[PDB]
Amino acid sequence: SRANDAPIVLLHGFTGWGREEMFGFKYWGGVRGDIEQWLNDNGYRTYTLAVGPLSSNWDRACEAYAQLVGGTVDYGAAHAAKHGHARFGRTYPGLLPELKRGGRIHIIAHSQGGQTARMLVSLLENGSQEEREYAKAHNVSLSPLFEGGHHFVLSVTTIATPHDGTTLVNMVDFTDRFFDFQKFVLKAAAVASNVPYTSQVYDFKLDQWGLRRQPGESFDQYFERLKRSPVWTSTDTARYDLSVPGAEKLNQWVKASPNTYYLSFATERTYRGALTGNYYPELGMNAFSAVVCAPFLGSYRNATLGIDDRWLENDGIVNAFSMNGPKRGSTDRIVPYDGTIKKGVWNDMGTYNVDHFEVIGVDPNPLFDIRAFYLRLAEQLASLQPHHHHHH
Ligand SMILES: [Ca+2]
Ligand SMILES: [Zn+2]
């Protein structure tokens, strides 16, 4: 039963927004309802983070930290100089000031949020040697996130995360297809992309890059500006971290903490053609994933890059193979769940038959008991022991 009372913190992917955005239409729950509310109602204290959807995992980590303890976002001086964006971002009140006094949390992340979560846990525990060295050499201030020694995260649970990247980034037309998912979520929320709404609606939180939707500019128009901006052309981007090479790079330094439990859930919404060996999208998958993305994922091979048949199964957006945990460029160990959740390693909870967006309720799927899924997940997280004694 319950063994800890750590609060749960939700974290989105390359799409996502705060509770007040999209006129209330939740990322965590979508057409289903409000996941956070379900958990709160059932006795699992839960909060939601909202960071930059298209920003680099690093940026997102920095934003999350600030968002969790309060203060002004500090991306790190070395980092900011390297990538040419602002050092300081937006300020936050802090959702959980208790973290500054011994508290702990469980992070439940979806999609790219799993990469963010892992990076956050890595920075909190080990800081950034680079950031630390730069401060000493240049006399600049240093964010507590880069010092090391924080123990805030009891667990990290990922759902449909591209731990090893996604080959979707290899599509010749990825640029346009990816932003189309930005239009999709807008459509799910009943928001048009060809309208210059005066209300913010969906804030990409690109304060470091000094980009924002301007008066008279629809999302469609904005997206075209973004495609040409550094949030799309730089290596300090979600675009980069999402790619197979990018994820590998990340995995080479973002390691599982021995003091944290990691759980992984994979998603699949495809079938295998008996003659092609390819995978095809199942009935029920959103049109934005099914037309050109799912088929590309289910048929794209590249032997030099090491994309083989194992990678074809997918959830319309990410290759299932890349979800159970980091593998490419990683020293992290993955163990198939057996009824016991082990600390400091990836507990592969298996593959669920739900698509990238049906898993968080953004796309309907009446056959998927979303409430049960999340309640069972919470139940599991609340049963983890912050201190596991060794035994026979
Ligand atoms: Ca569906
Ligand atoms: Zn950055």
Domain limits, the chain: 8-383
Annotated active-site residue 243? The verdict is: no
Q: Of 243, 210, 244, 245, which is closest to residue 226 (Cα–Cα)?
A: 210
Q: How far is CA 82 from CA 73, 77, 130, 186, 306, in A?
A: 17, 8, 11, 33, 30
CA of 367 from ligand 1 middle (Å) equals 9
Q: Reduced to 3 states, what is the DSSP secondary structure of residue 73? A: strand
Contacts of 230 (CB under 8 A, 6+ apart): 83, 84, 85, 209, 236, 237
**Residue 231 CA: which ligand is closest?**
2
Q: Is 309 annotated as contributing to ligand binding?
A: no
> What is the Cα–Cα distance from 294 to 306, expressed in whole angstroms?
19
Distance 45 CA to ligand 2 centre (A): 31
Length of the chain: 392
Amino acid at 20: E
Spatial separation of the C-alpha atoms in residues 193 and 191, rounded to whole Å = 7
DSSP for residue 343: B
User: 147: Cβ–Cβ under 8 A, 6 or more apart, which residues?
Assistant: 127, 132
Q: Which residues pair with 334 in a beta bridge?
A: 346
Dihedral angle at the C-alpha atoms of 40, 42, 44, 50, nearest 10 degrees?
-40
Using a CB cutoff of 5 Å, list residues around ligand 1, an ion: 284, 358, 363, 365
30 is in an annotated binding site: no
Ligand number with the minimum distance to the CA of 269: 1
Judge contact between 367 and 31, C-beta under 8 A. no
The answer to whether residues 140 and 77 touch, using CB atoms and an 8 Å cutoff, is: yes
* Residue 284 is assigned to a ligand binding site: yes
Residue carrying the six token digits 């729950």: 29
Residue 228 gets which letter from DSSP? Answer: T
Distance 316 CA to ligand 1 centre (A): 11
Q: Is 203 annotated as a binding residue?
A: no
- The topology (CATH level 3) of 8-383 is Rossmann fold (3.40.50)
- Was 164 annotated as part of a binding site? no
Out of 164, 315, 332, 355, pick the active-site residue: 315
Which run of H or E residues covers position 3? none
CA distance 128 to 149: 11
From edge to edge, which strands make up the β-sheet containing 105-110?
46-49, 8-11, 105-110, 153-159, 261-267, 346-352, 334-336
Identity of the residue numbered 260: T
Cα separations in angstroms, 377 against 179, 217, 255: 31, 41, 23
* Cβ partners under 8 Å of residue 340, min gap 6: none
Residues near 234 by Cβ (< 8 Å), separated by ≥ 6? Answer: 83, 240
The Cβ of residue 170 has, within 10 Å, a number of other Cβ atoms equal to 16
Q: Could you tell me the CA-to-CA distances from 55 to 51, 120, 170, 248, 307 in Å, in that order?
A: 8, 14, 19, 17, 25
Structure determined by: X-ray
Closest to 191 (Cα-Cα) out of 183, 384, 113: 183
Q: How far does Cα 336 stand from its chain's mean position? A: 22
- 173 annotated active-site: no
315 is known as an active-site residue? yes
Catalytic pick among 55, 56, 111, 257: 111
State residue 279 phi and psi, 5-degree precision.
Answer: -115, 140
Across 16-47, b (16+ Cβ under 10 Å) vs e yields bbbeebbeebbbbbbebebbbebbeeeebebb
How far does the centroid of ligand 1 lie from the alpha carbon of residue 364, in Å? 5
Q: What is the resolution of this structure in A?
A: 1.8
